[PDB]
Every structure is written in structure tokens, then in C-alpha cells.
Amino acid sequence: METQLQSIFEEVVKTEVIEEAFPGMFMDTPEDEKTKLISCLGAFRQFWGGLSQESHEQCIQWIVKFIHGQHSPKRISFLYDCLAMAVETGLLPPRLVCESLINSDTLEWERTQLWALTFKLVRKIIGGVDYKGVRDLLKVILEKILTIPNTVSSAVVQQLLAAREVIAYILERNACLLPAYFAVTEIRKLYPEGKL
Amino acid sequence: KNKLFIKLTRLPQYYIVVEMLEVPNKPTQLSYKYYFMSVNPAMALLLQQFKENMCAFNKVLAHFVAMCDTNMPFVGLRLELSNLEIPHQGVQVEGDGFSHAIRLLKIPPCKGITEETQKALDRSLLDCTFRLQGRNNRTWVAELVFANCPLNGTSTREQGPSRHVYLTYENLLSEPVGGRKVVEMFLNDWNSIARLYECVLEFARSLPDIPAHLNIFSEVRVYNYRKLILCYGTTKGSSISIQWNSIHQKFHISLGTVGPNSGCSNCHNTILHQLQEMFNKTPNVVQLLQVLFDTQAPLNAINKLPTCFSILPQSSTHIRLAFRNMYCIDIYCRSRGVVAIRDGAYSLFDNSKLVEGFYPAPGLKTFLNMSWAASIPTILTHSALNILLLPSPTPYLCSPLERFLG
Amino acid sequence: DPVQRYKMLIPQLKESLQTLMKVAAQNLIQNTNIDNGQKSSDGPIQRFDKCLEEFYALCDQLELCLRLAHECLSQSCDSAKHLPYPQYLAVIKAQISCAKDIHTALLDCANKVTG
Amino acid sequence: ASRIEDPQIQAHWSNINDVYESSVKVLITSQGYEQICKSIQLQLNIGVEQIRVVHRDGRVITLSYQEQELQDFLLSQMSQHQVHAVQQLAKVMGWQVLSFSNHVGLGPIESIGNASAITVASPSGDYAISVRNGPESGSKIMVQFPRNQCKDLPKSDVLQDNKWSHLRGPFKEVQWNKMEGRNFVYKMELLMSALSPCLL
Amino acid sequence: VSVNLEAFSQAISAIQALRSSVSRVFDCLKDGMRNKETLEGREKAFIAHFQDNLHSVNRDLNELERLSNLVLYSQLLQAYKWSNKLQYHAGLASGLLNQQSLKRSANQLVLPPQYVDDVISRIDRMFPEMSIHLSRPNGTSAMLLVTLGKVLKVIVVMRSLFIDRTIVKGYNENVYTEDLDIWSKSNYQVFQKVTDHATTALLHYQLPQMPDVVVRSFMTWLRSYIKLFQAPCQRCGKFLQDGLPPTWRDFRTLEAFHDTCRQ
Amino acid sequence: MGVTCVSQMPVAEGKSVQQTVELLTRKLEMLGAEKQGTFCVDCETYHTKLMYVMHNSEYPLSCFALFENGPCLIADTNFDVLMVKLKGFFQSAKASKIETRGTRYQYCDFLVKVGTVTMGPSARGISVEVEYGPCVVASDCWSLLLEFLQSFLGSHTPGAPAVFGNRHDAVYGPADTMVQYMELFNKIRKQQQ
Amino acid sequence: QYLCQPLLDAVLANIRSPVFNHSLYRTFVPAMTAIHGPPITSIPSVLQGEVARLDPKFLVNLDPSHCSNNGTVHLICKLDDKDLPSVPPLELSVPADYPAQSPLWIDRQWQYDANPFLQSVHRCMTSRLLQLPDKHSVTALLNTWAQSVHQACLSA
Amino acid sequence: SQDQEEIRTGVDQCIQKFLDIARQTECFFLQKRLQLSVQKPEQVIKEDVSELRNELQRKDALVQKHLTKLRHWQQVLEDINVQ
Amino acid sequence: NTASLCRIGQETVQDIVYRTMEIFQLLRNMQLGTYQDRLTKLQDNLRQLSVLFRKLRLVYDKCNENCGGMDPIPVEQLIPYVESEERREIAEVNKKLKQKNQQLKQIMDQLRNLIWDINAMLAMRN
Ligand SMILES: [Zn+2]
């Protein structure tokens, strides 16, 4: 079953070996981003509609560990666009994706492009979570931000700051994702009185 | 069903498929479709169309066949470079239009080499371009270009700070053009180059401070990044060569005579093994120059003896001479031009004779050439050693020493 | 005889190596103990130096025997390679001398033309 | 032989022939460098209906009675001998060969014969030459001048050291027309001597 | 015998190796451990080096035991030594200098038939397997029938002390034995490919001036075709590609290859 | 005379005698082999000792008479006429005639012939002969025949024949092929079952 | 193993003794020195090389407009050739530790829109980056950019 | 002057040095020829004139020898054919 | 003049290495009448080799002392990149050699036809 999803997603992003010898002579434009996304979304929709409810989440953990196992950032952003349209079309419940994205242990701050693209996608898809899920996401995002040192490199700081926009979006009072009392309760549980 | 399978003989498992189709508007013309097939009871693996831009030559067919035959050997080399964690740029069209090349960025640093020498090497490697040549298209050549050469030579190698070394590799007939042995041999040559760069850096650092006799006694001649040819002698005749043999993982020195004044040999061929071991234990070249300068003068005298006398090479600066088998004598060379001779068969401990035995009776002949008291050494000048060993007519042209033992 | 001697010394060389390794081990253990808490008997001990010189002496005797045999065999093969016997040695030495004259002539000419 | 005069052509017909067979020995040398330029030689077998060609590199080709086939084949063989001449000349002048391809596939799709390719480097480092001859488009030679020598290449601020200013750079082309000598090999060595060290 | 000389020379080196290896074990022990930047690293480095040194002593001792099983006058010896030295030196020098020749041009036939006959007889003296039959049916141009075992029957066509045409035929096939069948084919594709490769070897072996070493090398290359049908290709390991035995022998390297496997 | 090997390959499973040849011959065609005519080998026997007379179609005019271990006479076809004339004087035997009839396939200097020794009117068995015309030498061309056989025959490949016998520089002969055929024929006649 | 073992055992006994060398030293100094005698008589370099070995079509330079001289190197190079010079910057962010984390091209769709040819070059170069293998180099991105521009020139 | 590895490396070094310096002298001569041809396009023309005249003389001598042989064989054949 | 002396210097340095190679081959073939011939051959080779040294030396002195007025342009400034009565004598000699080559081609064609006709007849007579 994870073999099925393995064959699907690996057959999505295969790379051509014999190209760069006789470059561009093969008669075939490789599916550009939109057609490839539509085909990927269709095949994953087949596997998802086939899938059972209780098996709904271990496959998502496999998806996110397969995305975080990648190395090319274009590949990662393509599969994140796939996950974004898979949430946006209504196929996926928009809480499992966010939780398995953040609680993935491959998400460390040293993987700065993965950090930036991940928290960009969570900024895109957090608007649909119910408020208790937003509260738990707030807690795990704060605990993810808490692992950064006092000093980091001067180039990675802007890609690290992508979590700050998710935090600013959750604690924004006009957006009203959750009651603000829950937000200050989670914060003051993590930064008690006297802690910067 | 009307297709042609053009197999590539140089690089196997690759098949071009040329199919012909009828064009509807012209009943007297044909259309050609070219595909790149590959095979592993033959099993096909992948297939890809390739059809984009006297009349019997079909120019595009021969063009595609030549392009495939020229490009496909590079794919295996790229895969092998990627499999050994060697960061390399993709196959790129060279500036002179027609070509293919795989320029490496960084090599795996080394094993068994100090960190500072690794840094000095990594900051001097400018380019590691690989190219293909040779009939049947199966010879590879890597051109390494180093900068800031430590020390130059007597030859015309004192040009701009850019030394170009070409390393060629030709795999066997089997084991196709793209394989593991080529890059393995390349890494072996790189390791040898690094282990030699160790000694060249040591020598370059020690060049400003020289005991001032080895400077005129020895001179560097060539530096091809894989061999060190130093030359020593009063007339700059003798030559020693340093090289690292990765097969045995030990330094290999080769001695020769290049100069229009010398004996019949390098005169150091009797101490070649002890010098090999000496340089293998402590890789320092200034010690080699010093011991050569110290031991050349006694060796020039000990080589001209009649070959009766037998030369047993013991540890360095301890050459043994033995008239017949009954007699013996030890040659202890030391600095400042002195040699200490011994009784030979005598034992440096409890007074018992060795297997050869036959205690040399006179002993005091060495004292005038200035009971068991031959066992203690007697120093000389190398000039008294010249007189004691070069054959003078008698006070047949025999030596003094062989007259004594005779 | 040269092959026979090489055979005779080989068992002795193995014996000398065994004693040199064993004596070294005994000396190192006593020296470490003297330094260490363990106090070891004075005993005979046997000096390591005497054994190391004995091994070297056997090695020289073997090398001398082999070097002589190799030189003797090389001379014999060369002699075979090169009616009365006095005239035979005479024509050999004559050929040898004329080759040397050719040598000297080529040498002196090639050295007088330049350098 | 009368029309094409640049590389060379030679033919030595055999003494004994037959009523249904004959043989020649074609050689394509250079005008001045006969010794070194001896890499391409042919031995035609003129049968009753087919001409069999045996090249020196172990390649047997069965041509036709059609003159165009033989003419195109001989033109391609001359084009290949042209690059073999440069190879054998670089072997003699001590120039280091960097690359050699007998049938190159990069460039314009060529005529009856496939294009040849060679690239050699000067013995003293910096300078280098490249040659591409073909039956239709040939004699495309371009010298590789070193950097800091053209003075027209756009500099970059990323290059903050002078060590990188010694590599062979701008790849300037040379016109094979309006040159000296009388043969491709004459012009090739004159160009090699021009890019040599001035010992005058 | 020469085999004894090599065994003695190998043994002399083995004694030198044993003495050096024993000195190395003690000399390294005297220096003792080095810092190595880490406690585990220093202990490992000392143990590894000592064990390698101890093993080398064992290996060198074993070789000496195994090698035991296998095995007016002085001027004459000086002349012998100088003759051997000049022979080796001049051989190496001639090889290295004729390998790389700087000659670029010539500008700055008639031959006695008995001389060609003598050259052919000298070449036939060596290679006892090959038998060359001289004949002059048409003019001074000689025609050689060369029988190689039960394998080949080559028809060389000399115009002078020069090789012009070669047509190999099978042993069972008929060369017609008489007025010689110069113009014919073998009727077998393998022998036709061998004729093509022989013409290729002729075009390859072409010395400019000396007309004897060319024929010597041609006969030597032909003699390599005595292990035909009995050798495997050195590229594919196969005996048959498209029903053909390996047909090419590399010049400078008498090894077998199917001509499709270039080699 | 080119080194040859003949072996019998069992039909196996429930494959009919003819069905197996049809398949084996198609497998040979799948080697790029091209048919080069037809071959008929008809042999008659005599109970005199025992006489054998066989004639391959590959040889147009020869008739081979083999006397077991005794010498083989390669003679013209008029030999059969002499045999018939003697017939009243000669022994005849009882319907021991054996024939193998099959297609000839040529694969680049190797001729492969697969046929069904049809005994009398009823087929039983299969004979495969691979010949090499270029290979005049024999007994060490075995490596070749073996490699080619493992290519197509696969299982049931013969581990040589004894007609090669003692190692010798003796050339292979048409008589040797006929002796192989005679041993094969004695085996079909008696294999039974 | 054979004939050496007690020596091996001895030294394997006595490692981690602090006085260890003394003891070795003592018992091994005199005999040896008696017998043998006296003793003896900003921007990473890989990026600089990749830049030095580019085709003269490119004129790569640093980026002081956004992050400058920090570590990962932003680059605006150029396109200069017989082809087309559409949108020369293609800002490339090469992260530190170059033989990993293949560099990413910061997308700028604001300039590649408004004209069909630029939209086509953007589409084809993006697809070419999708088909590029993992751990690609800077030269790979430059070459695929050039060939994508060329495809847009010929396909249109 | 008054084992195998020594002579081996020695001949390697001396022969390679001789070859390099010979190729360098050849390069110098070729440079001088190139300069004289490009800047003095008159001595090269005189050289071509001399070479062409020598070629014509050689061709004339060869045709003379061929005519002598042809006349000899013509007389020989005229002698035969008779009865 | 000087451009031909330079070609002479080229041929001398191209021939000296061949002479040394012949000397090496002669010393190699000298294994231990014929000895006198080998000795005089080696001596003649050495004498001609020294004469070649003298010739190359003198032509070197000549080309170095010449240095005609027209050499202000250093090397690499002469290669062309992308971006009277002597000619009449040349044309006359060219026309003459063209006519002679056409005649020689006719002669060679006739000789080839003769040889082919004789070979065919002597082959078919059998
Ligand atoms: Zn093969």
C-alpha cells in the first residue's frame, strides 16, 4: 500500500539519464508543471479515494517524509504545490497535512529551504483548520522556533523568518483564526512570567 | 514493422531504432523516425523519440549515430563519478563547439594526509577537466592545472604559475569505457600526488635555511607533480628520483647517472634498500641529501675494490666489507668526513668469534695508516680511506688493504 | 654447498627470531613492572641487545652466502655465452680488446666534437 | 588529383591484374610532411561490379559502380586525413594532444562525410589550437589565447585574485584564408611556430 | 640455469626485507605512542602500526623459507660486462629514439632475386609451423604459398621484396597447386574477413626503407593465426559473434578480437 | 571435411515427434539462420558381421559403406548398383533401414541440421548435426561446437563424441561424420520404448 | 601470531600505563643505538573555479542589492551571445557547502510576463529545471537556461 | 666511461631531454621561417621558383630515361617477331 | 636567401637526430673484417655529424646576424584573425608546369592502358 504510493510518487519526479548527451534532441516536451500536477493529483486522488479513514494519516507521514527526503528545492516545491492543490480541492483534511508537516523530524532549521517552503505552505493552508487544531499548531510551531540558537548565519535569517509570518498570522486579531485567549494561554504556558 | 536497429559497437547495450513511414501527400517519399533504445531473451529498458531539426546519404541518420556514439561513453563516466560521491559538473559543450567534457569541482580530499597539506592542495587545484580521445573512443585524459608551484627545476619549467599535468587512462577492452577502474586509478594517482606534495612542501619550506653545503651539492631538476628528480655530485652527474607507488603504498626511489662526468654507476646502488627503508620511515628529503653527501665519498672508494673482496650491505652508514669469507671489516661513516673501521669478525660483546671467525691478526695496520683491541673503531679522513682503498703499486695494482689481508 | 648452507642457516634464523621476540617480551614486562606495582624476580633476564646482534649476524651470513652464489652462477652463465685452449682465450681477449678500442674511439670522438 | 591539391593524393596500381579484378594503393599525405602524415592509406579492390575499400584502421566498405559513391567516399577520406595530418604533426612538434574525435557529432549536420575534430595544446602551457575539417564545411581553426592577454574580456568582481588570470581564455578564431605556406600542413606548422617561444 | 639466478636474486632481497622489517618493529616501538588528537585514535594507531610491522616480519620470513625450496683475466670479465651493458643501453636507446622520430620528409625499384630468395629462406627458417613455398610463375614478381598448420593457406603476392596482395585460403580448399591461383576467393566468410584483416596488416606494417622487417612482422602476425577457432575474444569472452570466430589480432599485441569488437 | 557433431534430442513432455522439430527448427531460425536447401540421409543394413551403407544428400554422388570398427569405403553411386547385382549372393536383413530427413539451416559458416530418424514409416527420435567447414583441424574445435550448441541446444548438449577419439593432428573426415551417424542410428534402432 | 605473540601480548598488556614509553624507551634505546648507531642526520574556492571555467557567454557577478558578502552567494550573471538577452539577471542563490543543497533560482514572474516570448522561455526553463537531476550545479542551470531560450527561439 | 633499472632511467632522461630540445630548435627554425615568409614575401617566392625549376628538371630527366628504355625495348621487340 | 637558409637549418636539425639514431642502431648491432667495416662506418657517421654541427652553427649565426629591417612586429601580432615581375615569372612557370603535367598525365594514362592490356592478354592466354 505504501509500495503503491511509492510507485506513484517516484514515477512522478523521475529524472532522465540519457539527456545531456545529445541534448534536447528527444522529441518530447517533459510534462510542464501544470499537466504534471494535474496527473499527479488525479493518481493520488485514485489512491486516496481507495484508501480507508484509519489509514488516512500514515500515508501522509510517508508523503511528507518522501518530500523531506528530497534534495532539489524545485522538486520539493512541486510536491508542495501538489499538496496545496490536494488540500485546496477538498481531497485532504487540512489539519493532518499541517501536523505531519511540522511534527516531521526531518524539519530542522538547518534545512533552510525546506524550512521556508514548509512554513510557506502552512501559511497557505492554515486558514481552514478549526481553532483547537490552530492551538495545537501554535504550540508545535513555537516549539519548533525554540530550537534555533541565539546566533545563526546572516543569509539564512530570512528563510528562517518564514515561521514568524505563520505566527503573526495566527496571533492576528482581525483574522480571528482562534480566540485570542487560547493564544496567550499557549504562549504563557511556554514563556512564563520572567522569561524573555 | 519496417525498422532498422543500428547497434553501437563501441558502447554496447545501446540501440538506435530508425523506422520508416509512408507520407500521405507524396506517394514517392518516406519519413524517418529515430528512437534511442537500450537493452539489458533480450530485455528493453527505456525508449525515447528523437526527430527534430544525390539524396541517398541520409545526413541526419549518420549525424544522430555519430552523436550517440560520441555522447554515450560520457554517461557512464558521469554515473560512476556520481556513485563515488565526487562532485562533478554535468556533460557540457566545450568552448570549441564540438566536444564533451566533465570538469570536476572538488575531489575527495585524501586518506593519510595532513590537513594543512590538504588545504594547500585544494587551494591550488584550478581545473580537473576530463576528455575523451583515441581510436574506438575509449581513452580518457584528465588535465590538472596547479598554481603556485613550490620549487622549479633546471628545465624550462619556470614559466607563469600554471603547471599542466595530463593523466591518461585506457580501460581494458572489456569493462566498458565508463567504469569504476578509471576513476579508481585517478584517485590513486591523486593520492600519490598528495603524498609527494607533502615532501615537496617540506623541501620548499626548508629551502631558505640550508646548511650551505647541500645547496651547491644538490639541485632540483624537474617537478612533474608525480616524480622528484634531484641531482647531486661535484659535476651534477648523479640523480635520485622520488615517486609514490600506490600499488605497494611506499615511496620508490630510482637512481641514475646523468652528467658528462661519472663512474660506471650512480655509486649508491649498494645502499639502495637501506635508503628506501630510511625514506619510508621518515619522509624527509634534506636527510636524504645529507646522508648522500656524507656517504658518497666513502662509497666511491669502496666501489672500486676488486670483485675476493665481498661487499655486504648492512644498515645505512654501516657497509660491510669481507676479504674472502674468513676476514671482515665494518665501515661506519659519520658527519664531517670521517669513517670508523672495525676488526670485523670481532664481536661488540663477550669475546667469542662469529660464524666466519678467523680473527684478523695485524690490526695495527689501520693505526699506521692514520690483543683483541681491533674490536674498537678507528676513525679516518675519507682521504686516508682513498689511500687505503685505491689501488697503488707496491711500496699488479692492488690495494693497500688487500695487501694487508693477503 | 651454497644452497646447502642456505638450508642450514634457515632453521637457526627462525630460532634466533623466536628468542629475540621472547627476550624482548621478558625485558619489556620486567621494565614495566619495575615501573609498575608488580615487583618481578631479578632472575637471569637475558639481555635483549645480545639477541638482536645475533639475529643481525645470522642475516649477514645468509646474505653473504646468497650474494656469492648469485655472482658465481652469473659468471658461469656468461662464460658459457662467450682447437687449442690458449688460442681460444687469445682470440676471446683479442675480440674483447678490439671492442674496447672501438669503445675508446667512439668515446673520444663524441667527447671532442662537443664538450 | 588535379582539382583538389591541398592535402595530397597518391595511387600505385598493382603490377599483376586479372580480367575480373584489380587493385590500387591510395595514400593521402601532406605536401611537406610525408613522414609523419602517414595515418590514412587505402587499398581499393575494383571488382566486376563492386569496389571494396580496406582502410588502415580495419574498416572495410563495399562501394558501388556509381561514381558519386566513390567520389564522396574519397572526399570524406581526404577530410579525415586532414585531421590525421594535424594529429601526426602535433605528435612530432611535441604539442600535447588534448582531444581527438574521428567522427564528431556536435555542430552543423554535415555532408556525405562526418566531420573530424582535434584539439592540441602548446608545449609551454597557455597556447592551444583546435581543428575541425569536413567534406562540406571544413578548415575551422581557432586558437585559444590565454586570459589577461586579449585585454577585451569583461572582468568580474567575483575574481579577486591574480592566480586565475593565467588560464587559457577567449578562444579567438583564425582565418585560414590569406595565409602562408601552400599546404594545410605548411600553414599548421607555421601557426604552431608562431605560437611557439620566441628563441630568435 | 636462468630460473636459479632469479630465485637467488629474489632471495637476496628477501633477506634484506627480513632484516629491515625486524629493525622497523623495534625502531617504531622505541618512538612509542603519538598524541593523535584522541584517546581511542592514539591507541588504535599504535596497535595497527605494530601489527602491520609484526605481520611483515612473518611474511618476509615465510618467503625466505619458501625461496629455499626453489633454490689479464679480470680485463676479460670487464670486457664481458661492458659488452652486456652496451648491448642493453643501445637497445633501449634505439627503441626510445625510433619510437619518436623527428623526420618529416625524404627530399632535403631494382633488387636481386637471389637476395629476395635468401630473405624468404631466412624467414622460413624460423617459425617451424609455417612453410613458405617460393615460386615465380609470372616474371620476377614472386608468389608465396604459406601453409600454417591445418589452419591457413595464405597466398602472398610479391612484386619486389614488398608485399602487395594477400588472399588466405582454407587448408582443405584447393589453391590449384599450379599455373598459382592468384585471383580467387575462399568461399567461406571467415577466411574472407581474414583476407581483409591481412590486407589491413599489410597497410599497417609499412617500413619506409628496410624491406625485411616488414615481411618479418607480417609473418609473425600471420603466425598468430594458429590459435584461430581456439581462442576467446578478449572483449566479449565469446567464441561466436554471428557465426564467426574472433578474426582480429591487435598489431603490437597478438591478442584475439571479433572485428566488430574493434579492440 | 569440416568438424561435425551429431546428437539425439528427446522430444520431452507430450510434444509430438514432428511438433518438437517444428519448434526446434523455429528456434534455429531465431538465430538469424537462413535455410539453404534440404538434406536426406538414407541408410540400409546387411547382416554381413554387419554391413552399413549410408548416403548424406550434402554429398551428391558418394555412397559410404562402413563395417563397424572396420574401414569405411567412400565410393561412387554405382556402388549401390554393384550391391544390388550381388544381392542374390549378398545378405539382405529385415527392414532395418533408417532415415533422418530435415531442413538445413546456415548460420555464418555453421550448418545445423535437425531431423527425425523416421524408422520405416513411423518417426521416433531426433538427430542434430552442427558442421564447421572452415575448421579443418578437429578434436580441439570442440570448444567451438560446444559453445554454439549451448547457445541453441541448451540442455542435452553432447559432451563430445568418440569419433574425435585419441588426441591427434589427424584431419576430420567424411568417414568420421558417417561413423557418428551409424552410432546414432544403432541407438535409435535399439533405444525402444 | 606465530613467533611474535609474546611481544604482542606484552604490549597488549601495557597500553594505558602512563609510564609506558619510559619502559619501552629504556630497554630498546641502547642496543639499537649501539648497533645502528646515532640517530637521523570569503567566496568559496569551488564557486571561484566554476566561475573561471564558464563559457564567455556568461558574465557572472555578485549581488549587492539584496544579501551581499554574507555566505550563500546571490548572483546576477547575464546572457551575452548570438542568441537572445531576454531577462539577463536570473538571480541564483548558491548556498554554503556547495557539493550539496543544489542552488535554487529565485523566481521573478513580474518581468517574464507581459510578453509571450518571455512567458514561453519561463515555461520551458521551468520544465527543464523540473527535468534536471538532483544536486545540479550552477553551470547546469546556465546551460539549461541557454538551451531553453534557444528552444523558445526555434519552437515559436 | 672508465643493474637494468639504472640504464633504463638514464636513457629515459637523456633521450627525452634530447627530444625536447630538438623539438625546441625545430620550433625556433619554424618561427624564423614564418617571420621571413610573412615579412619578406620575396625570398619564399624565390624558393618556390627554384623548387619548381628543380621539379621540371627532374621530370625531364625521368622522361629521358624512360625514352631510352622505350627505344631499347622497341629495338629488342623489332629483333624478335621475325621468322 | 635567409628564408632558404632557415629551411636549411631546419633540415639540419631534423637530420642530426636521425644520424644519432643510426649511430645508436649501429652500436646496438655491434656484437663483439666486419668489425673494420662497422668501425669505419661509425667514424664516418661521427665525422658527418660534426660537419652537421658546424653547418647548423654557421646557419644559426647567419640567421641571427641577419635580422632584416622588417622585424619590428613581435610574434602573436602577425596572425590574421577574423576581426610585380616576380608574379609574372610565377605565372609563366605555372603555365609551363601545367602543360608538362597534362602531357605527363597523358603518358601515364597510355602506360597504364598498355600494362592493363598486356596483363589481361597474358592472363587470358592461360
Ligand atoms: Zn568479441
Curated annotation (Swiss-Prot), chain B:
Keywords: Activator, Nucleus, Phosphoprotein, Repeat, Transcription, Transcription regulation. A motif (LXXLL motif 2) lies at residues 385-389. Belongs to the Mediator complex subunit 14 family. Residues 1-244 are annotated as: Interaction with SREBF1. The chain holds residues 535 to 1212 of 1454 of the full protein. Component of the Mediator complex, a coactivator involved in the regulated transcription of nearly all RNA polymerase II-dependent genes. Mediator functions as a bridge to convey information from gene-specific regulatory proteins to the basal RNA polymerase II transcription machinery. Mediator is recruited to promoters by direct interactions with regulatory proteins and serves as a scaffold for the assembly of a functional preinitiation complex with RNA polymerase II and the general transcription factors. The keyword rRNA processing does not apply. Interacts with GATA1. Component of the Mediator complex, which is composed of MED1, MED4, MED6, MED7, MED8, MED9, MED10, MED11, MED12, MED13, MED13L, MED14, MED15, MED16, MED17, MED18, MED19, MED20, MED21, MED22, MED23, MED24, MED25, MED26, MED27, MED29, MED30, MED31, CCNC, CDK8 and CDC2L6/CDK11. The MED12, MED13, CCNC and CDK8 subunits form a distinct module termed the CDK8 module. Mediator containing the CDK8 module is less active than Mediator lacking this module in supporting transcriptional activation. It comes from the Eukaryota. One of its GO terms (molecular function) is transcription coregulator activity. Disulfide bonds: none annotated. Ubiquitous.
UniProtKB/Swiss-Prot annotation, chain E:
Keywords: Activator, Cataract, Intellectual disability, Methylation, Nucleus, Phosphoprotein, Transcription, Transcription regulation. Pfam families: Med27. One of its GO terms (biological process) is somatic stem cell population maintenance. GO terms for molecular function: transcription coactivator activity; ubiquitin protein ligase activity. InterPro entries: Mediator_Med27. Its main location: nucleus. The keyword ATP-binding does not apply. GO terms for cellular component: core mediator complex; cytosol; mediator complex; nucleolus; nucleoplasm; nucleus; transcription regulator complex; ubiquitin ligase complex. The modification N6-methyllysine is found at K103. Component of the Mediator complex, a coactivator involved in the regulated transcription of nearly all RNA polymerase II-dependent genes. Mediator functions as a bridge to convey information from gene-specific regulatory proteins to the basal RNA polymerase II transcription machinery. Mediator is recruited to promoters by direct interactions with regulatory proteins and serves as a scaffold for the assembly of a functional preinitiation complex with RNA polymerase II and the general transcription factors. Belongs to the Mediator complex subunit 27 family. This is Mediator of RNA polymerase II transcription subunit 27. The lineage of its organism: Eukaryota, Metazoa, Chordata, Craniata, Vertebrata.
Curated annotation (Swiss-Prot), chain G:
Induction: By 12-O-tetradecanoylphorbol-13-acetate (TPA). Ubiquitinated by TRIM11, leading to proteasomal degradation. It is found in: Cytoplasm; Nucleus. It comes from the Eukaryota. Expressed in all tissues examined, including heart, brain, lung, spleen, thymus, pancreas, blood leukocyte and placenta. However, the level of expression varied, with highest expression in the placenta and peripheral blood and lowest in the pancreas and kidney. Component of the Mediator complex, a coactivator involved in the regulated transcription of nearly all RNA polymerase II-dependent genes. Mediator functions as a bridge to convey information from gene-specific regulatory proteins to the basal RNA polymerase II transcription machinery. Mediator is recruited to promoters by direct interactions with regulatory proteins and serves as a scaffold for the assembly of a functional preinitiation complex with RNA polymerase II and the general transcription factors. Required for cholesterol-dependent gene regulation. Belongs to the Mediator complex subunit 15 family. This is Mediator of RNA polymerase II transcription subunit 15. The gene is MED15. The chain holds residues 615 to 787 of 788 of the full protein.
Swiss-Prot record, chain I:
Residues 34-58, 84-121 form a coiled coil. The keyword Transcription regulation applies. Expressed in brain, heart, kidney, liver, lung, pancreas, placenta and skeletal muscle. The keyword NAD does not apply. One of its GO terms (cellular component) is ubiquitin ligase complex. It is found in: Nucleus. Its main location: nucleus. Keywords: Acetylation, Activator, Coiled coil, Nucleus, Transcription, Transcription regulation. GO terms for biological process: positive regulation of DNA-templated transcription; positive regulation of transcription elongation by RNA polymerase II; positive regulation of transcription initiation by RNA polymerase II; protein ubiquitination; RNA polymerase II preinitiation complex assembly; somatic stem cell population maintenance. GO terms for molecular function: nuclear thyroid hormone receptor binding; nuclear vitamin D receptor binding; transcription coactivator activity; transcription coregulator activity; ubiquitin protein ligase activity. Disulfide bonds: none annotated. It comes from the Eukaryota. Component of the Mediator complex, which is composed of MED1, MED4, MED6, MED7, MED8, MED9, MED10, MED11, MED12, MED13, MED13L, MED14, MED15, MED16, MED17, MED18, MED19, MED20, MED21, MED22, MED23, MED24, MED25, MED26, MED27, MED29, MED30, MED31, CCNC, CDK8 and CDC2L6/CDK11. The MED12, MED13, CCNC and CDK8 subunits form a distinct module termed the CDK8 module. Mediator containing the CDK8 module is less active than Mediator lacking this module in supporting transcriptional activation. The gene is MED30. The chain holds residues 29 to 178 of 178 of the full protein.
